[PDB]
Amino acid sequence: NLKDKILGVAKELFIKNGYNATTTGEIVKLSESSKGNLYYHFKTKENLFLEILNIEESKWQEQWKKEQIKAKTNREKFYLYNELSLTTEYYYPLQNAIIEFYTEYYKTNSINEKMNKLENKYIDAYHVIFKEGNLNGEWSINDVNAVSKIAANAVNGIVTFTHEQNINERIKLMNKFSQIFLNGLS
Amino acid sequence: NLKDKILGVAKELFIKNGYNATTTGEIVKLSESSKGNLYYHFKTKENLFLEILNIEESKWQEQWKKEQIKAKTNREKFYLYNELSLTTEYYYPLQNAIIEFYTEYYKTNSINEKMNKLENKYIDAYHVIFKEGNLNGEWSINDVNAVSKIAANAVNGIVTFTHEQNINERIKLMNKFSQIFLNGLS
Ligand SMILES: CC[n+]1c(-c2ccccc2)c2cc(N)ccc2c2ccc(N)cc21
């Protein structure tokens, strides 16, 4: 595809190399297009990036839906969502590229611009879970927005910063996490 | 000393221009040494950075050892240590050199022998906190090593991924976390 097949390119240059570890010229290579095709939908490096981000976060949010089904109590949705967060091939596989981006481009309205849209969807699944937790009364939080951002990131840390130790060790830890967190709420 | 001098010039160069752009030639010139004497001491840029990384980790351990008398109980140190991490990393100079490096040497097994031992150093502080909390009966945790691991990375995510918010709110979520998390141990 025109400006669509190009999108799947950078995605890999970012997951395979990082943000400034991949450039337009680069893209253009396996891309095979002109530095104007990008002009249209992709105004700047940031855009292309901030764009691919959300896209992927969505394939994730989508898989999450087509999967939570195997969880009864919301509390199970919690443990699960975090667990799955570990195995997906979506979004998280370029959270380091984002760590960089957070620096290389923070003297510029993008963080809260389009990147604020992501910040929302990124903590949505948690928001539901927690919110619907008050209903089912599995617990009860008086600031669901705070706890939601909290959970989201911590979990994201457990996923990002431990990508070295074997995959099964990881799954165990994350579960010992959810136990503690959920238990710290009620 | 000529070693320290290298380490001294090297650090600022990295702080002034990131990890990637800083060349050893620069380091040797401004340190007034020789690639020879340099190579003898560190063998590589990658390796040089690591040693600075370690020297820094030891300076951290220092601050923590002094700045922690302001926290009587282990339950308070956990609160203090966490806040401390957020604030200091808000304006940590090398912060950008670090991110470049972790992205510049992810899969590299070798650079990961020390890479981990160092990381392991930050996890110790928590480990210490939790064990002491044990001996005192502030809580009860047997798999200290697991919690310590979870607390380190959970916090890191809270600190790293929350960059879009004002330092007042951040310190708020972080203290909220510390309370919630710490609340799932008794
Ligand atoms: C947890 C290790 N760790 C730290 C770190 C955290 C606390 C103290 C010292 C270093 C880190 C710190 C910054 N700024 C940026 C990236 C990373 C990172 C990236 C990947 C990884 N696999 C472990 C990582």
Side-chain angles (χ1 to χ4, degrees):
Chain A
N1 196 297
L2 199 291
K3 38 54 61 186
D4 212 61
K5 217 84 296 76
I6 269 188
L7 282 157
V9 186
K11 167 246 184 56
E12 129 284 304
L13 283 89
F14 286 152
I15 286 190
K16 201 278 161 56
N17 305 298
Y19 193 76
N20 55 24
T22 45
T23 187
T24 72
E26 267 216 51
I27 295 180
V28 191
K29 194 151 190 172
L30 187 53
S31 177
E32 305 170 5
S33 174
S34 67
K35 59 235 54 58
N37 221 187
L38 310 312
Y39 131 67
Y40 214 63
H41 294 156
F42 319 153
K43 265 78 181 66
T44 182
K45 192 181 182 185
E46 290 192 291
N47 273 66
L48 169 76
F49 185 58
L50 219 315
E51 179 53 39
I52 314 174
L53 292 183
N54 181 92
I55 293 176
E56 294 288 335
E57 205 288 356
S58 303
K59 325 243 308 74
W60 155 234
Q61 198 77 41
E62 176 144 294
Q63 153 177 155
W64 163 230
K65 263 48 187 174
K66 298 191 297 180
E67 301 215 331
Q68 58 190 301
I69 266 58
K70 306 192 183 58
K72 297 59 262 176
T73 47
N74 285 75
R75 170 153 160 173
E76 288 184 7
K77 300 290 199 56
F78 192 68
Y79 275 87
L80 189 62
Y81 179 75
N82 295 170
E83 276 174 304
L84 266 319
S85 283
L86 271 167
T87 66
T88 13
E89 69 256 58
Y90 299 129
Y91 185 88
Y92 298 90
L94 46 63
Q95 214 62 19
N96 310 232
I98 297 183
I99 291 190
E100 247 181 305
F101 174 96
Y102 244 154
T103 76
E104 305 172 11
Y105 275 113
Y106 195 113
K107 347 202 131 284
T108 75
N109 201 179
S110 292
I111 309 299
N112 45 301
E113 168 251 347
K114 207 174 186 292
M115 182 166 241
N116 209 76
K117 150 227 62 184
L118 259 166
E119 217 299 326
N120 276 39
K121 181 184 305 183
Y122 166 77
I123 65 103
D124 181 65
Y126 279 106
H127 188 290
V128 186
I129 301 174
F130 286 114
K131 184 64 271 291
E132 172 49 55
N134 293 289
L135 290 71
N136 190 28
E138 301 189 62
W139 64 83
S140 59
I141 311 165
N142 38 172
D143 52 337
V144 184
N145 286 312
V147 182
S148 281
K149 298 199 202 74
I150 284 189
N153 291 161
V155 179
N156 198 186
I158 291 178
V159 178
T160 318
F161 311 122
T162 68
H163 212 303
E164 81 170 71
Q165 40 260 78
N166 97 313
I167 207 72
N168 200 186
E169 180 187 303
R170 304 248 297 289
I171 318 263
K172 315 308 88 182
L173 295 167
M174 182 75 73
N175 280 320
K176 189 52 195 304
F177 172 71
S178 308
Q179 182 189 308
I180 304 197
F181 197 78
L182 296 170
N183 179 56
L185 282 162
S186 48
Chain B
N1 180 283
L2 161 58
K3 188 179 181 187
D4 303 333
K5 218 115 115 294
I6 303 187
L7 299 178
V9 185
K11 177 174 169 191
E12 54 198 9
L13 269 178
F14 286 133
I15 296 184
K16 220 260 189 190
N17 280 294
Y19 174 73
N20 295 100
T22 304
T23 73
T24 52
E26 298 176 4
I27 306 184
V28 170
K29 215 305 95 61
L30 291 145
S31 63
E32 283 176 54
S33 180
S34 39
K35 336 178 184 187
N37 181 293
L38 200 265
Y39 178 75
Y40 160 79
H41 279 296
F42 309 88
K43 278 151 141 287
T44 53
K45 168 121 82 75
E46 320 79 276
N47 200 29
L48 200 212
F49 189 71
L50 262 162
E51 199 146 2
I52 292 178
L53 231 42
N54 267 122
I55 283 174
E56 298 291 296
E57 122 64 33
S58 301
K59 305 183 96 160
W60 181 223
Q61 285 321 316
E62 255 315 298
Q63 294 176 222
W64 182 222
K65 181 196 282 194
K66 300 199 58 172
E67 181 77 36
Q68 89 187 190
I69 74 171
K70 334 202 181 309
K72 174 166 160 56
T73 91
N74 306 293
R75 151 173 286 264
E76 310 181 315
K77 298 189 171 62
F78 179 68
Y79 260 116
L80 190 56
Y81 193 56
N82 282 170
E83 304 161 328
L84 215 65
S85 330
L86 175 56
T87 54
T88 43
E89 159 137 352
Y90 188 57
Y91 56 65
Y92 191 63
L94 280 163
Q95 178 104 301
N96 222 289
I98 282 190
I99 293 176
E100 278 165 56
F101 185 90
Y102 277 74
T103 62
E104 216 299 73
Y105 277 104
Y106 204 75
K107 41 71 178 61
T108 299
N109 59 308
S110 189
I111 283 183
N112 239 58
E113 195 263 350
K114 27 281 182 177
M115 243 296 117
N116 179 53
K117 304 290 175 56
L118 181 50
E119 139 107 4
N120 229 120
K121 286 200 193 69
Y122 303 104
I123 303 191
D124 299 0
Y126 285 104
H127 187 300
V128 176
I129 293 175
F130 290 128
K131 181 183 175 186
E132 297 319 293
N134 263 167
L135 287 62
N136 259 48
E138 310 220 8
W139 45 65
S140 174
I141 315 167
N142 30 285
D143 54 325
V144 173
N145 279 312
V147 166
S148 292
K149 243 192 270 198
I150 304 164
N153 299 292
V155 169
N156 230 274
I158 279 184
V159 162
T160 301
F161 301 112
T162 307
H163 213 171
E164 76 309 329
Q165 344 194 185
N166 72 294
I167 160 81
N168 277 295
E169 175 71 3
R170 300 196 197 188
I171 280 190
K172 281 304 77 184
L173 304 180
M174 178 80 256
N175 273 325
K176 187 53 197 165
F177 172 72
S178 303
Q179 183 196 212
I180 302 166
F181 183 98
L182 222 44
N183 232 284
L185 302 185
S186 315

